[PDB]
Amino acid sequence: SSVTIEFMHSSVEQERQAVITKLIEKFEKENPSITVKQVPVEEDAYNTKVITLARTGALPEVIEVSHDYAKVMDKEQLLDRDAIGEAIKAVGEKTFYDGILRVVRTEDGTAWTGVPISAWLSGVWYHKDVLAAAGIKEPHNWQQLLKASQMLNDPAKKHYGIALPTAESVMTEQAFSQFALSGGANVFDAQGNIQIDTPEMLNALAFYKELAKNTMPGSNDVMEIKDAFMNGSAPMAVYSTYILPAVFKEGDPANLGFVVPTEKSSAVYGMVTSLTITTGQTEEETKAAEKFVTWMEQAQNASDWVMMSPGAALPVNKLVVDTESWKNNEVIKAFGQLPYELIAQFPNVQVFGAVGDKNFTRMGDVTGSGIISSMVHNVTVGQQDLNTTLSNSQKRLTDLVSQ
Ligand SMILES: [Mg+2]
Ligand SMILES: [Mg+2]
Ligand SMILES: [Mg+2]
């Protein structure tokens, strides 16, 4: 037959639009019955475009979504869970690495919010030569990580042991999360209730405060973290995997190391990018949406999507590492075993709101308020009282979603 469907994505850069354009041409050649239209919309405009086209019923059939925004559309019942589950069933539930399907799970835990295609990770990076010269082995817990930051802290030379995020932004909530989660604390419990005033969270908030005693003074934003790790003022830094292209361009790839904040468990933060399928479409469009999403999970197709950001974007599909576009990539080859060590950390992906097989959509309102990040900002930058800040934050949190 014939049907035209739309693929909405966040690639406004002309370099990545050409990769997607080449992918659509290949898919259309192998499926002359289907036509795929590009809808490139930047990430700052993504939300306002989606809710507009949804109100008018003009939602694109396939949409690239992060796992946090996929919960927003699923909360509004804009996602076809049946078509998404059918696509994952076709690709194979075990074609994805361990720990990737769990984060994109729905609140009731019955289905998924999208078919994952990539993910970037965040953790504590370090210069191997600095730690190896000082006799500091790779930390295996909080205490060893905090000690290493204390030996490497030298405010007399404007040198700091670790670059730790402290600004009122989503990154600080991200950085604090892998310490809160490694300590066994989540914003939500198994029943979906918000509860952050707990001994496990207070312990992680106290350690983040202690680790913040070895960072740059003031409010540290994403740019200050990157510059501090790049210029040598901080041998350790909490950053996303996007530090890999920066190190490949202006640094030393063989000098980059990675440690996972560990205490009660091992916690690495990750944002999973998925190809979701929307509701309100004809049966011909839905089956064509399943076909394109499944076709995108093939070896060369998923690798072509992941390699639009070499090093930073990591393959959640197990078929990519065997593809030639990945194995001979200069950025991948430069970092040696680090991209695979990062891939091996997928089972340790822990994010706020994901409690077991359930990721609660209510975390979107928590992150959108900045309450967690402002709490860390007040405890570290403001030196405000630990317990009153935690309890007050829990009060606004309950006040937010009980209103
Ligand atoms: Mg600052
Ligand atoms: Mg390591
Ligand atoms: Mg339609």
Automatic annotation (TrEMBL):
The keyword Ion transport does not apply. One of its GO terms (molecular function) is metal ion binding. One of its GO terms (cellular component) is outer membrane-bounded periplasmic space. Keywords: Metal-binding, Signal, Sugar transport, Transport. It is found in: Periplasm. Mg(2+) 2 binds at residues 219, 224. The keyword Transcription regulation does not apply. Mg(2+) 1 binds at residues 138, 258, 341. SUPFAM superfamilies: Periplasmic binding protein-like II (SSF53850). Belongs to the bacterial solute-binding protein 1 family. This is Multiple sugar transport system periplasmic sugar-binding protein.
